[PDB]
Amino acid sequence: GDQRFGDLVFRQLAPNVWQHTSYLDGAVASNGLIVRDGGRVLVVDTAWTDDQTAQILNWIKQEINLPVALAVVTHAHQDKMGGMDALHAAGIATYANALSNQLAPQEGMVAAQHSLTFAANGWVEPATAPNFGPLKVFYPGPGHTSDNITVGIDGTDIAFGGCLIKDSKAKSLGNLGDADTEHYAASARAFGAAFPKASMIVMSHSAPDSRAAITHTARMADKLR
Numbered sequence: 564g565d566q567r568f569g570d571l572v573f574r575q576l577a578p579n580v581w582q583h584t585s586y587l588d589g590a591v592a593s594n595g596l597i598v599r600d601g602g603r604v605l606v607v608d609t610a611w612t613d614d615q616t617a618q619i620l621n622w623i624k625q626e627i628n629l630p631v632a633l634a635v636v637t638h639a640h641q642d643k644m645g646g647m648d649a650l651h652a653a654g655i656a657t658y659a660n661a662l663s664n665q666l667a668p669q670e671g672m673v674a675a676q677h678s679l680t681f682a683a684n685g686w687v688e689p690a691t692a693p694n695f696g697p698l699k700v701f702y703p704g705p706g707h708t709s710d711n712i713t714v715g716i717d718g719t720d721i722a723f724g725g726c727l728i729k730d731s732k733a734k735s736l737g738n739l740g741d742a743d744t745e746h747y748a749a750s751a752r753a754f755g756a757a758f759p760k761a762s763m764i765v766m767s768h769s770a771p772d773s774r775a776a777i778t779h780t781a782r783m784a785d786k787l788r
């Protein structure tokens with residue numbers, strides 16, 4: 564039951580949640596989310612490119628036909644922020660970790676329009692995340708990158724680890740070029756603790772998994788110290 568639109572694949576995960584998948588040209592998949600929140604849609608992560616991100620927005624108009632209120636992007640790398648210009652051109656309010664916005668020029672990304680900040684416990688400072696509906700934004704600590712953030716969807720089973728979390732069969736932690744090898748394991752575990760009842764763990768580079776993806780990721784990362 565996956566749907567294709569252009570270069571993008573969509574999979575419904577829950578009545579009001581879909582995974583978007585885009586490919587960097589041997590094609591490399593990256594996943595984000597689409598959430599229907601009453602009369603408005605919320606997006607987590609861009610596609611790799613502006614043209615792919617415009618395809619997400621066009622699919623949403625065709626299949627859901629509700630306005631896209633805002634997008635949260637989960638770190639300043641191309642798979643998650645490559646399509647910022649497309650979001651801005653479409654009039655979608657964009658939010659990213661302050662640190663992602665600060666790193667964005669140095670990582671070749673366009674900054675979001677708004678900065679999220681976080682408490683010492685990892686939870687977003689709520690005044691920086693106005694009207695986020697069911698999206699619960701959590702900074703787990705440095706791991707895949709220093710700026711990586713994660714998102715749980717309230718009212719559902721379903722938390723999004725972005726590029727921090729790898730699937731439970733993985734043999735590696737992917738691209739570690741910008742990683743914090745010392746703190747990674749703790750950050751993975753902190754994600755798990757933040758969303759303790761999430762049973763469907765969505766991530767950037769594998770299909771959705773169980774909580775096993777969290778504990779497996781942390782076990783791998785333990786060996787990086």
Ligand SMILES: CC(C)(C)OC(=O)Nc1cccc2cc([B-](O)(O)O)sc12
Pocket residue numbers: 587591640641642643726737738767
């Ligand atoms: C090493 C493999 C995964 C085979 O190839 C890539 O890394 N693809 C990418 C190309 C350009 C840019 C990027 C950024 C990436 B993130 O997952 O660290 O956000 S991946 C990636």
Ligand SMILES: [Ca+2]
Pocket residue numbers: 613645646647648649673
């Ligand atoms: Ca661009």
Ligand SMILES: [Ca+2]
Pocket residue numbers: 670740741
């Ligand atoms: Ca870099």
Ligand SMILES: [Zn+2]
Pocket residue numbers: 638639640707708726
């Ligand atoms: Zn990355």
Ligand SMILES: [Zn+2]
Pocket residue numbers: 593642726767768
């Ligand atoms: Zn990635």
